[PDB]
RNA sequence: UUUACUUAUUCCGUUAAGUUGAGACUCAUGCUCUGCAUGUGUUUUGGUU
RNA sequence: UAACUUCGGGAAAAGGAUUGGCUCUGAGGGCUGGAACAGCUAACUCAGAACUGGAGCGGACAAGGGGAAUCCGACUGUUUAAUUAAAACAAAGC
RNA sequence: UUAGCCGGUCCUAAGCGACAGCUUAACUGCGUAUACAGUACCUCGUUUCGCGAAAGGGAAUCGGGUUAAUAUUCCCGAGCCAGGACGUGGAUACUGUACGGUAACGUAAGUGAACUCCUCGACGCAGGCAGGUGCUCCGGGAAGCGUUGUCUUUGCUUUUUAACAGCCACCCUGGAAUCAGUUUAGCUGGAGAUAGGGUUAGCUGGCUGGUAGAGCACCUUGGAAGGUGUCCGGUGCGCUCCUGACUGCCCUUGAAAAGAGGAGGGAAAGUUGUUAUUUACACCCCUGGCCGUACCA
């Protein structure tokens, strides 16, 4: 349901304990890109317009956190 | 245009009745539908919401009155003889 | 002469402190900002709670405990009142430099509770007069 | 055989008053100690239609002298009467239109409305719409009072009974004719259903004691006594004079 | 063409059943149920609307904050503001009348 | 045969709140400081109690 | 477009003429840059003319017969479920 | 024949059973009369219990999938509500409950007992007018399909986005006649109009999240695996239901109660730390009984 627009919130609701998994989307028109974090009450949800910066990103989440789902 | 030679706003009731009857009604239809001036703000705004109600439209108070008109005439003679009797009273 | 002047007691009709009785200060017309005649109102948000004489004398010093306000209101807003403060407290002194700028107005309430405190208990007017009938207008609450 | 249309009225059921939208019974404020060595000021703070009536409500927002609770009184209105006026009810209130004085400090020649018949009655005389109780003279000492009622009539009454100084509001709702069948049907539906009422000549001889023959007449006099039962008592009861007047 | 059924209990045109056509990611077309259109709270004396303060119905003004329910002043939750201003300048006045006559009275 | 009483009996009203007979609190028409009283006191505004 | 009339009606009174197809013409808006001009552009609605046909054309469907008088009831409304809808009941007014 | 969210269940309407008693040999009939919070100590106290709506009032749910027969009930996903709550991290106060704006009112939070008043619940019919949902319609783009003796840049089908969640009348300045503003219609204005600048209400409006992974339309290899595409605009006294403000009509003026909230009031607590207000400040945690649910109509 909720988005977060900036890189400090998304950092947070990653480390939260009780956040289960990302499924993270990618879709080509160009590579836009979704992150979502489903958590407790809220699936959170973090969009990306640069595939550079998404590459970055995906070594700063964390290992010990458990799933990640990709369409393709 | 005047568009009715006297039936006024009682063309309406059409063509039955009888003309006597309507005639009884178109004088004091024309009462009821009138607008009165205002005890209280002065503004000619006032429109009988029910029989023995009038609400000032610009002012948003409401009334008591006649039927058919704001003031009753008999009730204006006692509005006349209660301020004398008071008077005399002391 | 303006019936508002530095050291007159108003009432406040509108915005949130509504009712509330205060000194006016200082008097405007205009600046840059603002189009219209304002004046520094300082008055009494929440006014001393009633009290008896067999309450102990802690909660006396409590109750009469004030919590003023500063505001800039429009001169339409506040209304006049007959009473009028300037020979008791001086308004002159009660920080003329400090305003909005550098939001020292929180400075500004603790010279208030110091100056009103003072003035509601040991209320006496200097020299003559006994009670003075002003100051005792600013205590009651303006019940509705 | 058979129970005439009159007699089944009593029996309640399908005649009695349809009283659902109807607000509140109207009254005068209860008899205090306040009304009777003093005054007590009201507030006018509505004016109603009440449905199956001719005049109007105000609803009256008196202070309790005992709890801090507000009460609320019905009235009937007199007319002249706004929503913001203050009524003052009590003995030692002023003889103005609104005021509920007691009988023996108006004086005489003054038009009252919605009277106590006794002391403390609430309010039972000249109710409806136009009408009025004009008062005519008091006793020596103050105690019983003689009032003129909107019949003709002249009624002994007690000095500490009270009503409203002026006229009830909806004056002159006759004047008009009803044109319609329509507009009758809608006046009695919020009264009880009285209403269209058939002519006992057109009944059959069961139904009715006029009704029967080969022709729509009567056949004995329509004038009958005081004595007569019930289901005799039909047409021009107990009459002392019969045509036109005069 | 598309012609669409009722889908809560009750099958009739009250006022509680009143309905909205939507389309959905199906592409069909189905009811929905929003309900009665909520009166704004008009407050007295002068029964105008309030301002600051929104249309709900009036179990779901249990879900909003306090903050939301009123406008901060006195009377706020339920006065017309302009209102307000006829009790302080009654209570000003109609205590400075009775004080002015209280005085005149030591004689 | 007429008209006094009130407790039988009857009817109405109240959220069973101020009844009966004495008394003073204020000013007030005003006389004598304190007197019998005749007397009233919230009525100026859609506040508050 | 009449008698009559409670002046509201009668009245679609009565009595006449036209209508298809095809090809055109005229009138009726909106939005942009500052004497009114310059650009871009969107409705189904009226009026008129020419031509053409086995004189047809509201081409099927749909859709008042009219007028002159008398009796009763004023009018709308109601009624004997399964032989009677009326001139009977009701009705406003008195 | 699978439910916290669809209904019953709860509330009261017309009315109906019983209490106190009152009638009658009882059967019955009437029934609003009555002594019905801070172990111990006070101070308040007027209504009597219940039945009565599967179309009135009312806590909360939507998308796709699924079976021989059930689905807002199963599954996958996304939420919401009632009751009760731990924990970490933020606000506020600590001689006493936050601030800002001239105001209308505002923001991540922003104590409020007794008692009282108010709002919502809560309400007619007709008329046109404006705006919106869905439907119907016209044109371009991309797929597949149809017709083809003749013509036809052609005719037809698909091109969808849920509840839920975030963001996009009134005040100030001012002072009106040569009256001005304004609707289709009238109305509005020194009890402050036009105008300039604000505040607020809103719908079934716009954008993003939900959300393409789904649904839909096609194509190619197996003998069920893998792909592309799902785009961009108009039009109206149109038809549907809804909202909004108006105008008119009445000897017709168009329910109640449960329940939710506001305000006036200031009772209580709190002394710079295990404190105490926040149980809807944000996130986190726990539980949701009973009966109907097939099918015809």
Redesign the pocket.
């Given at each position: 349901?909720?988005?977060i627009r900036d890189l400090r919130k998304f950092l947070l609701t990653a480390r939260?304990p009780?956040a289960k998994r990302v499924?993270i989307?990618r879709?080509?028109k160009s590579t836009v890109t979704?992150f979502?974090i489903?958590?407790?009450?809220?699936?959170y949800?973090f969009?990306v317009e640069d595939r550079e910066k998404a590459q970055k990103l995906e070594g700063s989440l964390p290992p010990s956190l458990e799933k990640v789902?990709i369409?393709? | 245009a005047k568009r009715?030679?006297?039936?006024?706003v009682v063309?309406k009731y059409?063509?039955?009745?009888?003309?006597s009857?309507?005639?009884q009604v178109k004088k004091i239809?024309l009462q009821?539908?009138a607008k009165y001036s205002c005890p209280?703000?002065?503004?000619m705004?006032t429109?009988?919401?029910?029989?023995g109600i009038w609400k000032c439209?610009?002012?948003?108070?409401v009334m008591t009155g006649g039927?058919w008109t704001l003031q009753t005439a008999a009730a204006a003679t006692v509005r006349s003889t209660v301020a004398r009797l008071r008077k005399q009273a002391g | 002469v303006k019936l508002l002047k530095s050291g007159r007691v108003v009432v406040?009709l509108?915005?949130?402190?509504?009712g509330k009785k205060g000194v006016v200060v200082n008097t405007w017309e205009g600046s840059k900002?603002?189009?219209?005649?304002?004046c520094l109102v300082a008055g009494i948000?929440?006014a001393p709670?009633?009290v008896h004489k067999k309450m102990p004398a802690?909660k006396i010093?409590?109750?009469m405990?004030?919590?003023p306000?500063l505001?800039?209101?429009?001169?339409?807003?506040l209304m006049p009142t007959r009473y009028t403060v300037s020979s008791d407290m001086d308004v002159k002194t009660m920080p003329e430099d400090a305003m909005?700028t550098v939001?020292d107005?929180?400075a500004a309430?603790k010279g208030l509770?110091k100056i009103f405190y003072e003035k509601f208990t040991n209320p006496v007017n200097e020299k003559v007069g006994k009670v003075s009938k002003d100051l005792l207008f600013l205590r009651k609450?303006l019940?509705? | 055989g058979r129970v005439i249309r009159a007699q089944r009225k009593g029996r309640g059921s399908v005649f009695?008053a349809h009283?659902?939208?109807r607000?509140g019974e109207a009254?005068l404020r209860?008899?205090?100690?306040?009304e009777?060595?003093?005054?007590?000021?009201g507030?006018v703070?509505?004016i109603?239609?009440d449905?199956?009536r001719?005049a109007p409500l105000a609803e009256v927002?008196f202070?309790?002298?005992?709890?801090?609770?507000?009460?609320?009184q019905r009235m009937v209105a007199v007319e002249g009467m706004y929503?913001?006026q203050?009524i003052?009810c009590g003995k030692?209130?002023?003889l103005?239109i609104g005021?509920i004085l007691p009988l023996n400090k108006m004086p005489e020649g003054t038009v009252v409305s919605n009277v106590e018949e006794?002391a403390?009655?609430?309010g039972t005389l000249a109710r409806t719409s136009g009408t009025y109780a004009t008062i005519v003279g008091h006793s020596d000492d103050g105690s019983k009072t003689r009032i003129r009622l909107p019949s003709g009539a002249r009624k002994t009454v007690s000095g500490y009974s009270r009503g409203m100084v002026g006229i009830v509001a909806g004056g002159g709702?006759?004047?008009?004719?009803?044109?319609?069948?329509?507009?009758?049907y809608?006046?009695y539906?919020?009264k009880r259903n009285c209403?269209?009422?058939?002519?006992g000549?057109?009944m059959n001889p069961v139904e009715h004691p006029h009704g029967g023959g080969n022709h729509?007449h009567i056949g004995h006099p329509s004038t009958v006594s005081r004595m007569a039962a019930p289901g005799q008592k039909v047409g021009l009861i107990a009459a002392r004079r019969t045509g036109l007047l005069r | 063409?598309?012609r669409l059924v009722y889908?809560?209990?009750?099958?009739?045109?009250?006022?509680?059943?009143?309905?909205?056509?939507?389309?959905?990611?199906?592409?069909?077309?189905?009811?929905?149920?929003?309900?009665?259109?909520?009166?704004?709270?008009?407050?007295?004396?002068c029964?105008?609307?309030?301002?600051?303060?929104?249309?709900?119905?009036?179990?779901?003004?249990?879900?909003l904050?306090?903050?939301?329910?009123?406008?901060?002043?006195?009377?706020?939750?339920?006065?017309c503001?302009?209102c307000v201003r006829?009790?302080?300048v009654?209570?000003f006045?109609?205590?400075?009348?009775?004080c002015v006559k209280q005085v005149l009275?030591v004689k």
């Open positions: 349901a909720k988005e939260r009780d499924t989307v879709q080509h979704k979502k489903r958590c407790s009450r809220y699936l949800t969009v789902s369409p393709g | 009715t030679k006297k039936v006024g063309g059409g063509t039955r009745y009888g003309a009857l309507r005639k239809e009821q539908h209280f703000c002065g503004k705004a429109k009988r919401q029910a029989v439209r610009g002012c948003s108070k039927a | 406040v509108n915005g949130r402190h509504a900002e603002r189009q219209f005649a304002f948000e929440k709670l009633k802690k010093e409590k109750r405990r004030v919590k306000f505001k800039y209101i429009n001169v339409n807003h909005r939001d107005r929180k309430k509770k609450k019940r509705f | 009695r009283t659902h939208k607000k009254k209860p008899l205090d100690f306040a009777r060595r003093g005054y007590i000021k507030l703070k509505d109603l239609h449905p199956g001719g927002s202070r309790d002298a005992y709890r801090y609770k507000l009460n609320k929503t913001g203050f003052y030692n209130a002023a103005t005021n006794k403390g009655d609430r709702r006759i004047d008009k004719p009803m044109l319609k069948a329509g507009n009758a809608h006046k539906k919020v209403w269209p009422k058939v002519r000549v057109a729509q | 063409a598309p889908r809560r209990h009750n099958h009739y045109a009250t006022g509680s059943n009143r309905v909205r056509r939507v389309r959905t990611p199906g592409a069909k077309v189905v009811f929905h149920n929003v309900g009665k259109q909520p009166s704004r709270p008009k407050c007295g004396n029964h105008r609307a309030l301002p600051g303060i929104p249309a709900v119905a009036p179990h779901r003004l249990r879900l904050k306090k903050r939301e329910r009123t406008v901060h002043r006195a009377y706020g939750g339920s006065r503001h302009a006829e009790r302080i009654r209570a006045l109609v205590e400075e009348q009775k009275q």
